[PDB]
Amino acid sequence: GRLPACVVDCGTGYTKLGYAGNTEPQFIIPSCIAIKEKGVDDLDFFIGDEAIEKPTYATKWPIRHGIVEDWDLMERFMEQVIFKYLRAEPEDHYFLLTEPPLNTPENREYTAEIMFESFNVPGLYIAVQAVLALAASWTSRQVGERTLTGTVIDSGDGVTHVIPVAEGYVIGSCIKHIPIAGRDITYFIQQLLRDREVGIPPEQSLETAKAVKERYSYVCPDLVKEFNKYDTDGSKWIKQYTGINAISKKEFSIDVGYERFLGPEIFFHPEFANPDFTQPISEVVDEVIQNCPIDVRRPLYKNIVLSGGSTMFRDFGRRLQRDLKRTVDARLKLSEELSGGRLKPKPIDVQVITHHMQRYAVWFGGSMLASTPEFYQVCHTKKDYEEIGPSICRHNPVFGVMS
């Protein structure tokens, strides 16, 4: 109809909600709910930025590593997402929701039961986030390069996923998980600031490690040359961060030094912070593409799409492309050296695509998908829910190539 659909992307750290057809999400709120811990007392709760620090309320996080843990808190979260922030009458708007990778169909049936039997939505589409990131990557390339085959590096506030997608379908047996994302980076930056700097209050130490990460961090080509830059000409590179105390308000200034490049370094050296994991991210991407079938590996090497907020560093795609090229030419040189039979395999082009809408890539893909007129031919309506049952939301048909 004339009313645009509602696109809600619930993450582990941040929920991005808005209406379809828009470039940016209307609200990016934290994915937490503060509750009171008979009557109307289940409506006494807050979500988002009003749920962070309340005195009489307890803050719960219903989503851990993408999987919904508590469904009552998720239902109340969707109540205040629909009726307080979006202000949408839910019987008039179609809904596009997202799911984590390797989600069970029982979770899709629970989400469909919440959406249809409690809010009475006219339609509901549950979308895989890797296909939405591949669709959001289309607004940087030409009109002949718009395909649905590629590798998605989804790095948020949880586990970083390396997902291969072949022709719009997710190869589920070749998905790999790296246990490094933005929470691990801000914990590493918090440990570095705890070891070096003084004056940081202990009740704000997670906050000031956040704003150092979002404003001053980048990646570097070489660690030793960067340390020599910071040690020799240490006035151009060392910055100052000024913050206000929550209690007894005083401006404190700290020196932001070595943690600018050592922040995002743990993607490429995971043994700096994580003891159990030691395999770098380019080896994980190389292993994922080498575990795929041989007739699809070169489209996966040609199209690597970054998505998520933890991929929003400077030159992150450049260092990922350089490390993947130097680890994919080593196998070709080893095959040319160990065999030596003048086979001469074809060189592989590795291309990592960085676009403008890289932070909310899943929401932008959902907004571009739900604005198409074919989106109402792919949804599961409430009539099909009453006729067939909740088993219609186990399968969602993959959208074709459009715009």
Binding site: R215, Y216, Y218, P221, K225
Partner: peptide
């Protein structure tokens, strides 16, 4: 190859 660095902030 390397790509230098920018001593600024976002």
């Amino acid at each position: 190859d390397d790509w230098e660095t920018d001593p600024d902030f976002v």
